[PDB]
Motif scaffolding. Structure first.
Motif, mmCIF file in Angstrom:
data_model
loop_
_atom_site.group_PDB
_atom_site.id
_atom_site.type_symbol
_atom_site.label_atom_id
_atom_site.label_comp_id
_atom_site.label_asym_id
_atom_site.label_seq_id
_atom_site.Cartn_x
_atom_site.Cartn_y
_atom_site.Cartn_z
ATOM 1 N N UNK A 1 0.675 -1.183 0.101
ATOM 2 C CA UNK A 1 -0.012 -0.145 -0.089
ATOM 3 C C UNK A 1 1.020 1.279 0.116
ATOM 4 N N UNK A 2 0.490 2.476 -0.424
ATOM 5 C CA UNK A 2 0.860 3.689 -0.580
ATOM 6 C C UNK A 2 0.124 4.672 0.191
ATOM 7 N N UNK A 3 0.716 5.346 1.225
ATOM 8 C CA UNK A 3 -0.024 6.159 2.064
ATOM 9 C C UNK A 3 0.888 7.550 1.860
ATOM 10 N N UNK A 4 0.080 8.666 1.837
ATOM 11 C CA UNK A 4 0.724 10.013 2.174
ATOM 12 C C UNK A 4 0.912 10.442 3.135
ATOM 13 N N UNK A 5 1.591 11.433 3.653
ATOM 14 C CA UNK A 5 1.806 12.112 5.034
ATOM 15 C C UNK A 5 1.639 13.688 4.812
ATOM 16 N N UNK A 9 -2.567 13.341 6.110
ATOM 17 C CA UNK A 9 -3.601 12.901 5.357
ATOM 18 C C UNK A 9 -4.136 11.478 5.291
ATOM 19 N N UNK A 10 -3.361 10.499 5.616
ATOM 20 C CA UNK A 10 -3.829 9.073 6.038
ATOM 21 C C UNK A 10 -4.082 8.411 4.647
ATOM 22 N N UNK A 21 -0.852 11.588 -8.101
ATOM 23 C CA UNK A 21 -1.798 12.207 -8.471
ATOM 24 C C UNK A 21 -2.525 12.987 -7.476
ATOM 25 N N UNK A 22 -2.844 12.486 -6.294
ATOM 26 C CA UNK A 22 -3.726 12.951 -5.372
ATOM 27 C C UNK A 22 -3.033 14.323 -4.675
ATOM 28 N N UNK A 23 -1.758 14.429 -5.073
ATOM 29 C CA UNK A 23 -1.058 15.801 -4.414
ATOM 30 C C UNK A 23 -1.430 16.913 -4.965
#
Ligand SMILES: [Mg+2]
Ligand SMILES: [Mg+2]
Ligand SMILES: [Mg+2]
Ligand SMILES: [Mg+2]
Ligand SMILES: [Zn+2]
Ligand SMILES: [Zn+2]
Ligand SMILES: [Zn+2]
Length: 87
Positions: A1-5, A9-10, A21-23
């Motif tokens: 899995x890939x999670x942002x911080x 953000x979680x 992309x979500x950034x």
RNA sequence: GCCGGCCACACCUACGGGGCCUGGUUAGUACCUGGGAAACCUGGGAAUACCAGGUGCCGGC
């Protein structure tokens, strides 16, 4: 899995592309940038970029060996055929 | 209609479709970066194939 911080953000993503992309939301800079020389263009998704690169790519006329034309844009490649090869 | 912007969803067609775009899967894989004794981990990351629809908008005479 890939999670942002970004800011805790979680959000968990399956593929690291979905992440990047979500950034867009956080910050603002359009994530995807262009590799071609001197082309400060940026994009939203990676698919949208792949398609852009078709620009710097070419558009070669393959209507006959004798012809070895290569237009810079789809429109131009079309005008080429519009005149050079009729009937 | 002509032109120009975008640079094929715009194009070709025996009119059945082809091509192209789009979203899932193939695949976070094959595979390179690099760290490692190694299990793995880090950062990139296809091809091929298959399902699901879509096929020109904007501005000037
Ligand atoms: Mg550049
Ligand atoms: Mg036109
Ligand atoms: Mg990896
Ligand atoms: Mg008009
Ligand atoms: Zn985030
Ligand atoms: Zn570019
Ligand atoms: Zn030609």
């Amino acid at each position: 899995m890939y999670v942002c911080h970004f800011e805790n953000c979680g959000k968990a993503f399956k593929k690291h592309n979905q992440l990047k992309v979500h950034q867009f939301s956080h910050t603002q800079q359009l994530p995807y940038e262009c590799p071609h020389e001197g082309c400060d263009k940026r994009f939203s998704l990676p698919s949208r970029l792949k398609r852009h690169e078709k620009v710097h790519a070419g558009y070669p006329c393959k209507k006959d060996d004798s012809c070895s034309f290569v237009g810079k844009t789809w429109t131009l490649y079309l005008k080429h055929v519009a005149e050079c090869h009729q009937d």
